[PDB]
């Protein structure tokens, strides 16, 4: 007798998703506070964060459960890498049109003031920013902190596992009680 609780629930959530039973999926996630966080590979997720391909990581993020601080960290850093690339328009756009940044504006106003100040400076002072703690280390920290919140589950695990129980019954049968 071996036990696992959260994994079973995640299996159920995946089944609900594949079967287009979206509302039950939502209600389940809310009621048990367990979220289905399917990514093709955790390796690919971390690698995507490390390589700085923010489009993909934000696309992936939109499908996920979100601790507010992890999202504001992420979005903040995204804005930083944007202003370093001088993509100021996109940076401002993210500052005003994204939920984590508005929440950041509400709960931590001086911080958002710091971010906008950073966006509006004539050149990117990389020395201060990445001098205290490097870009590689920031992306590493974000990659880990977010990877802890994600899971990889085979495409149709619940049905596959039920198929396995059926094979077990048929070919190894069951103990008498």
């Amino acid at each position: 007798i071996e036990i696992e609780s959260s994994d079973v629930i995640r299996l159920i959530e995946q089944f609900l998703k594949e079967s287009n039973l979206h509302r039950t999926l939502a209600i389940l996630q809310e009621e048990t506070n367990v979220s289905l966080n399917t990514v093709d590979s955790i390796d690919g997720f971390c690698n995507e964060i490390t390589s700085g391909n923010w489009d993909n990581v934000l696309k992936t993020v939109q499908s996920l459960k979100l601790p507010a601080k992890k999202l504001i960290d992420l979005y903040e850093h995204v804005i930083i890498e944007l202003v370093e690339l001088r993509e100021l328009a996109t940076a401002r756009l993210v500052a005003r049109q994204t939920d984590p940044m508005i929440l950041l504006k509400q709960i931590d106003p001086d911080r958002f003031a710091r971010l906008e100040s950073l966006i509006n400076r004539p050149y990117f002072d990389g020395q201060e920013v990445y001098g205290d703690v490097s870009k590689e280390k920031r992306r590493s920290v974000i990659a880990q902190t977010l990877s802890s919140e994600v899971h990889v589950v085979a495409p149709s695990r619940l049905l596959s596992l039920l198929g396995q129980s059926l094979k077990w019954q048929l070919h190894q049968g069951l103990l008498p009680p």
């Binding site: 700085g52 391909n53 923010w54 489009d55 993909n56 934000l58 696309k59 939109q62 995204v78 944007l82 690339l85 993509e87 328009a89 996109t90 756009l93 993210v94 049109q97 994204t98």
Partner: peptide, 16 residues
């Protein structure tokens, strides 16, 4: 605007 590909894709993903 948005000459970089990752920037365009990020823009479209977030802003549909």
């Amino acid at each position: 605007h948005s000459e970089n590909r990752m920037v365009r894709s990020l823009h479209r993903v977030l802003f549909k």
